[PDB]
Write a protein that binds this ligand. Structure first.
Ligand SMILES: CCCCCCCCCCC#CCOCc1ccc(CCC(=O)O)cc1
Ligand SMILES: [Fe+2]
Ligand SMILES: [K+]
Length: 552
């Protein structure tokens, strides 16, 4: 039917039906709280408890299960051969790098030791969310004696506007896992990088640990250190990026935020509501995938506990600390990118595509909003909308109005912005953090799920040190299995905009959708043409690859 807000219905012709639907919604979709301090989730002990309309269809259920089975059968074969052999060379990781890898993963296996490939991933790799433009040297970067030349190169880049940083201080104080009684280890690194005129982003220095007042300074690793020393330092930043990417950029910001959006929407916006109709398709499978994740991925004795250095509880502590710090602006590429100083960096394909995708969605949302809300007053008086943002910000996000989340929507502009934030969260925000796994994480030394020795406090690493720190064959194989499972071409995916159900009636909304689809296709083509000229195509925000919801 035609959508109708409560403002559209002063005689209450649809009041009883919408009120009855919301009362049933609020019984079926209740808030749960998997861990103290985390943003809230759907209340459901496991997948069998979920409302029926949230369950995987058969095709998705078969796909998700069978793909685990295949990943686990491959892990069994890998492990059965590797126990019979030595594991004493970086070439040992070849033995687990089976056929069927993506073209980009084959490039990573070839080039992972290149400093330019290490730096490239901060712009356009699996985790584009951490890098920030530097306007001063961080207070933690303290120089041991003899490093005057480093200090001058850092000053030249800073004066030229070309100094960037990746600071992993969220890992400070996080407890590391113990796996089959062997201690795992975490670092708390900082990497300073230079942006070159040709677009390359090069690491200048790495510090692995925070200085401690009563202690000698951490060493500063440099690209001129002995090859294994600098390699080990880089591996440690890569292992640290795996932890903050998967937990903060991917789980919290993609998956868990999309679930908060979904639950608050189910609880407050009835099916006759235009903004329900606009949002719905973008929630597909989010609650079941997350329930599955809480019961097998990040659960006690789950994947993280089995193979990941933050596993065993530290991962939950990091989630609660990151949850307390989320800001609204960080979910909106125009604000996030300005704030991090990535706007205008021609080498950031993530920035260029994120901003364009945000605009195309913004136009679609504005289209639908203007069909149903003629004035700012018609937004202000929509009490379902007002209940909606409050439930989202106050209950779902544990009181986040001081971090920029809305508790009222008082204009069409505001409504459009917030809806746009919601749709981008469920789509591009996830795709850009999820799709890299297949290309960058299947070559395990490029993103070690764990580390088995403490980070070095000297410059004497050998290959033996590197092999003994890097994941063992089992940990590395399970990493490959799950990253393939999640990362691989999704046979049941719905691409952005391509949902088949018609929530809206009428030519009005149909025309806005047709235009969204046309603009998305034109953007996809423009990225495809840019990518044909690049050494490494940036694929993760192309509309043809961006999924319509968080489903995996
Ligand atoms: C060694 C770990 C490699 C993979 C790390 C991936 C972390 C992903 C973080 C964000 C997310 C999510 C949704 O989670 C998907 C999910 C759910 C259940 C399971 C366990 C059973 C199975 O693999 O089928 C794995 C993955
Ligand atoms: Fe995901
Ligand atoms: K209206």
């Amino acid at each position: 039917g035609t959508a109708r807000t409560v403002v559209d219905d002063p005689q209450g012709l649809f009041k009883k039906h919408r009120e009855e639907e919301l009362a049933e919604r609020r019984k079926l979709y209740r808030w749960g709280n998997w861990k103290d301090g985390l943003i809230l989730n759907i209340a459901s002990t496991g997948i069998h408890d979920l409302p029926v309309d949230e369950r995987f269809l058969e095709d998705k259920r078969i796909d998700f299960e069978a793909s685990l089975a295949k990943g686990l059968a491959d892990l069994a074969v890998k492990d059965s051969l590797n126990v019979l052999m030595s594991w004493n060379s970086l070439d040992s990781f070849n033995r687990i790098f089976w056929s069927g890898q993506s073209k980009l993963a084959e490039r990573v296996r070839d080039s992972w030791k290149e400093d330019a490939l290490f730096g490239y991933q901060f712009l356009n790799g699996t985790n584009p969310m951490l890098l920030r433009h530097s306007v001063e040297l961080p207070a933690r970067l303290k120089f041991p004696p003899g490093m005057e030349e480093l200090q001058a190169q850092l000053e030249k880049e800073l004066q030229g506007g070309t100094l960037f940083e990746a600071d992993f201080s969220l890992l400070d104080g996080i407890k590391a896992n113990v796996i089959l009684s062997s201690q795992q280890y975490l670092a708390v690194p900082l990497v300073m990088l230079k942006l070159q005129p040709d677009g390359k982003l090069l690491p200048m220095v790495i510090q692995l640990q925070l200085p401690r007042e009563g202690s000698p300074l951490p060493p500063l690793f440099l690209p001129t250190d002995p090859p294994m020393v600098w390699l080990l330092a880089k591996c440690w930043v890569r292992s640290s990026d795996f932890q903050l990417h998967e937990l903060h950029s991917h789980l919290l910001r993609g998956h868990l935020m999309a679930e908060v959006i979904a639950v608050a929407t189910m609880r407050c916006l009835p099916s006759i509501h235009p903004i329900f109709k606009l949002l719905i398709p973008h929630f597909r499978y989010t609650m079941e995938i997350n329930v599955r994740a809480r019961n097998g991925l990040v659960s006690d004795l789950g994947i993280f506990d089995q193979v990941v250095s933050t596993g065993g509880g530290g991962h939950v502590e990091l989630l609660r600390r990151a949850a307390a710090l989320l800001t609204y602006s960080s979910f909106c590429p125009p604000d996030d990118l300005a704030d991090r100083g990535l706007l205008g960096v021609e080498s950031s394909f993530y920035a260029q595509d994120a901003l364009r995708l945000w605009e195309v969605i913004s136009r679609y949302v504005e289209g639908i909003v203007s069909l149903h809300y003629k004035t700012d007053e018609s937004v202000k008086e929509d009490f379902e909308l007002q209940a909606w943002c409050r439930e989202f910000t106050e209950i779902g996000l544990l009181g986040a109005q001081d971090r920029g989340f809305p508790v009222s929507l008082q204009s069409k502009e505001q409504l459009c912005h917030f809806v746009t934030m919601c749709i981008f969260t469920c789509t591009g925000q996830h795709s850009s953090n999820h799709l890299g796994q297949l290309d960058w994480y299947t070559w395990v030394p490029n993103a070690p799920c764990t580390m088995r020795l403490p980070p070095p406090t000297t410059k004497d690493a050998t290959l033996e040190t590197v092999m003994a720190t890097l994941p063992n064959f089992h940990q590395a194989s399970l990493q490959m299995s799950i990253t393939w499972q999640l990362g691989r071409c999704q046979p049941t995916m719905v691409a952005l905009g391509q949902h088949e159900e018609e929530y809206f009636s009428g030519p009005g909304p149909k025309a806005v959708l047709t235009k969204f689809r046309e603009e998305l296709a034109a953007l996809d083509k423009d990225i495809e043409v840019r990518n044909a000229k690049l050494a490494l195509p940036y694929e993760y925000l192309r509309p043809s690859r961006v999924e319509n919801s968080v489903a995996i």
